[PDB]
Amino acid sequence: LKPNAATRDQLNIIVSYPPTKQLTYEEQDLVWKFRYYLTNQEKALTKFLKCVNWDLPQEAKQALELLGKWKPMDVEDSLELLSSHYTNPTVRRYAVARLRQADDEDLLMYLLQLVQALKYENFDDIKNGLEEIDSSQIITSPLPLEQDLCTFLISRACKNSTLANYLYWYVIVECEDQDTQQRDPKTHEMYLNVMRRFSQALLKGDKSVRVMRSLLAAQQTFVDRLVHLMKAVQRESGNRKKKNERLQALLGDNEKMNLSDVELIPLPLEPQVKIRGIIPETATLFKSALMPAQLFFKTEDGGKYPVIFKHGDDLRQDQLILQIISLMDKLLRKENLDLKLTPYKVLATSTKHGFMQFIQSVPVAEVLDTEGSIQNFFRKYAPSENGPNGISAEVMDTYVKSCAGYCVITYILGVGDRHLDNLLLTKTGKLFHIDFGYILGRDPKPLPPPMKLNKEMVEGMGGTQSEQYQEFRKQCYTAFLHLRRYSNLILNLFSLMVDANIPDIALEPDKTVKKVQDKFRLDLSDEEAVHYMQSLIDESVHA
């Protein structure tokens, strides 16, 4: 009922363990013994539920008593309770009870996974919420510890417009997943019931909640017309010029296509940006064989929002990685470190198509061909006399920071196929990575480097003996310590992705979380972590 100083130290090690680490029987028995002492440690609760055999009515009953007796757990912690491991309705309702404590700002950072977590919810309880079916026709065809994940997510989506947009598109892609349809019909039936319950709830609401449904419909209808247009252009017989001419021709004909002049609808990619249509003229296809288009949406306040519309490709792997980069950037900023990262938006509108936020930048490879070096590029577009190596100091500070940020982020995520065409640079200093088809240690070539640095990247900083290079190193190990601090949050979100049909996750689902886990080097203390990071940087610039 009360432990001594020796057992308290052992309990503290188990509590500190990664959420994904498997407890030993000895470890499990120690947590169950002093379960009534641990009630004052909110961080211990996750490790406590991990001991229980819910198939045993007595262990299940005993455990739930303690759940209501425990110190209410943090929001990052409750994400573990919504994984495949838990089927107990009272545990799953506990996680939703603690999810309600989060801000909508925080909720959007976890939403992609919260949608995936519905796969582990009670499908009948979702079905009973309702008062062959085309998923993308539900919203475009209207008819005249108490809450679960479905009820909760919908309740919040009605109060928040930004949340509704992502809840909609995330659930529509899930319904659109043909693998899930062929291999898990009960799951597909559930996602349709989520969309059906979403549509139903919006219709019962006030003047604005009712307009939210109309706006989602208008967005679905727009995307649908853009897809049809994409199919026509991709079928067009002729060269890139012939295809661009047909692309510009069809967008221009508003009466026939209805994509250049439309009433203010939110941009699915970033709903805070309202659009009036697509500029026909500036629309061109990227040289790429996948035939993606560059589209300049006319925004609410005269601005131009360039997007990459991809058709005939699955953007869910890039969608996941860019939402994790956005999360890692938000947590770094929270700890007072802004490394000038480009967490550009990516939203799949189907398994077949989706949007990407276009950021005006030049690939490092082109930067090297058109100017000679990163320093030669920065000398032309951002000159300064007093500045380091003739470059504006702000542009150099921005370059050192972003290089440091992406080296750590791309290292933790195991981002492969890292050529200088996949590495983009900005005239303000901003470095960033694109095209995430190879993650979690994958690569098109054997024996890939864990630290993704280049000879020219360092040369752009002004060489290895520079003050900038020291700051690059300093910002690398500092971003590493901060991202290690939020590992319980990062690993729980990746945990909820094991069945999300992401190609590099789908390869070894049972393992994939340990791949990120290992990268953090949780076995090392912050001091060893600092030295390890320096070793990775050292090894990259040498070899």
Ligand SMILES: CC(C)C(=O)CN1c2nc(N3CCOC[C@H]3C)cc(=O)n2CC[C@H]1C(F)(F)F
């Ligand atoms: C920049 C250009 C040369 C490309 O590499 C195009 N490009 C591309 N640009 C991206 N950027 C562009 C800059 O802003 C951020 C994101 C949206 C992201 C991304 O995944 N790709 C994939 C390869 C090609 C494709 F055209 F096929 F899509």
